Subunit: 166 residues, 6 copies
């Protein structure tokens, strides 16, 4: 299965790298999409290469979506193309994994009303204002949406997402 | 007039330091409140001393509120006392100045429903979801609430807030 | 009134940003001059755009001068044009505001002989050797020359300078 | 199964965090052992808590071993107790996973003569001089020893190690 | 011969470390004096241990003095005890080596009028105002005073100072 | 005498800068060779200019070799040309000075069997596996090979190497 990542500079390093490798282990093809070609750098200094830009992404060519946290979501959520990618994939019922600030992108896509999930505790009120029934758990599974809160939840986060992709 | 600042570590340096000195110039007494006594450090390294903790703050003792941006608001908005301080002061109609991520505290206080203002563009969707008519202006004045977006707006931000306190 | 700033990379961030916005608030036009066009970065990481180079600066076109501190003055004071700009404006009796290491430029301009002011305490001996009656005060006003010591003096610094420009 | 990690300050962040969560996903208990109690910080800034010190480790109480890379191995390999732990566990046939500089600890344990595996290419000559049949592959499996080279190999590294612990 | 170093946090790393070892090579005993016991850290991150505090130093117990550059001199020159140490040793005709900002300490000691030397070009005007006939050379030898400008002058700087100590 | 330095990015700053100036003091010509032209930066941030690339180096055109430590050796030792340069110069009996991780390049050159010397203690086992009679001393002299362990050994390191070039 082809998994797409929507991220940018200042992403939370492990929230991108962990799922990237965890999914590759299963045989899934992983792709990193961002504003421009070249590379992006995490808040901790890890550098990763961008596979394609938001503009070149066709939501229909991917089967799953992963939204890492960090400061990147606040910039990504202002990009019409990136938000539409997430809106389409999420609404189509495709698997979507989010952690930390990653769901800010889904908030902006306007697809979370009535959904159940979690996020970085610091933005729980924004998730709630978007219609999310917020849960304080290491991992929440709501249909196609698997969400976690912080790096400490990584193990549980992909444990559930991997199952969904099987 | 006694002005209270609700902030913490990782505050946007100039968004705290600028209004602090600008108001001090007018003769106003400025107080920095945070989680604990001692000092706090901004995103850029500037250090400032804390005057009193959130718990020791009595809203009735202060006449105006300033909410600097940065990453601090996302931690401060999780403190019940800090949020109650903002809710009370804002509700009483006391002058409240916010910039960047600062209004995330007002979102959590539940006082922005039906109000008009601005903020860091990255969280405009969260402001909208809280009931704010979001304006893309360097400074917005809605009754007692004076709001701005980024450091580039500093001059207009305090220009309007100072008038409110006159 | 048109205010000129002589600075460069490694300027003390708030000593540049504070007066820039404070004066802009009053309606004054503020211009940043440095070695080359583009942008310069302060000791703490803040970035600001350069309006014009020292070479393109015509002293007769500006009404006031601001000299921020940091490590920048020690590089700026070695630029003949920059020093001549300061010498002319100061000599003409135009308002000149300096803080921290900023007056090192005035020392090099040779205009402080017999004047009274202050600066970062670390260079008081250099100010004295240049003929300055050094005062340990948050702000000193000597005719057209308004001087301060450290970031903690910002409020008093511009409070007096603004009056001079009124 | 109880998995022990031998590491210290300046460990390669993801080479410790990735296996830590990947193994926890399977239900294995993971323990971080280092020089002293408290916390240790990776080269990229991630902080992890130390569960026990080398001195308090009883090799017989753990079932598997993980050796992350970074600069930590060159310090850990100088601690006779830490090296004795690795020698004991490795020679007993217990599963041992190494990556990057991690195997420097095994070189010092004197248990690699005649074995096959890999490591950070920069120290391949040292692995060879220690009797290793060095292979340039993302992952090598030689009995109880699963080895990899760099962070890009993470997915294959744990893919194989997990199979060993099953 | 016993050589004393007057420095503090933020010293230019190589301007302290180079002469320290270069003189030890000759068999001279080297001592690091600063504000407090423990260690100090250079601007580049090198950490060195303090042998004794300024207060515990007896100028008569040392035969030569070295003044590294960096930001440390601006803090050291405000310490009455440190300045008196330099004033006494320099006036007694003992060998004194200075580089970069190091001579700011001698300026404050008030012993440079009429002397010939150099320093970081950025403070040449302050050296001149102190009565120094400033020379732009990698190394200047004026009796007991050997001075240089920047790290690039290190080889020439100690080449001359070593001769003086022979 | 013409002294060649084999190094690269992340070299231990003082282990390159110290011998560079100490040797220049004697009148020796020093040349920095690395992967590409331009500049290289030490682990602590010091920048030095590259005089020539490994590819353009003719071992016969240089009389002595210096191998600084840091992380650079582990990358340099993977460059077949750089390693061939060290092998040639070392086996020809030309003076060679190494410190810290510097000798990893000599291990890869295959010229240390039966030789006596030292290095960063962290890689002593690798030096031993390469046939070295490892000695724990600030400086070791074995014919044309002068070796040291850490920055604290600098004074003794060059004291002995200088004697060799005399």
């Amino acid at each position: 299965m082809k998994v797409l990542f929507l991220t940018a500079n200042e992403f939370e390093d492990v929230e991108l790298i962990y799922p990237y490798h965890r999914l590759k282990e299963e045989g899934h093809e992983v792709y990193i999409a961002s504003f421009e070609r070249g590379t992006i750098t995490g808040k901790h200094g890890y550098s990763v290469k961008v596979d394609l830009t938001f503009d070149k992404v066709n939501p229909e060519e991917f089967d799953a979506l992963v939204l890492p946290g960090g400061r990147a979501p606040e910039r990504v959520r202002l990009n019409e193309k990136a938000v539409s990618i997430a809106r389409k994939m999420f609404s189509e019922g495709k698997p979507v994994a989010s952690i930390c600030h990653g769901p800010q992108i889904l908030i902006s896509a306007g697809v979370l009303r009535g959904r159940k999930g979690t996020s970085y505790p610091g933005i729980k009120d924004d998730m709630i204002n978007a219609g999310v029934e917020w849960v304080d758990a290491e991992v929440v599974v709501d249909g196609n949406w698997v969400s976690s809160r912080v790096p400490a939840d990584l193990y549980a986060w992909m444990r559930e997402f991997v199952k969904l992709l099987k």
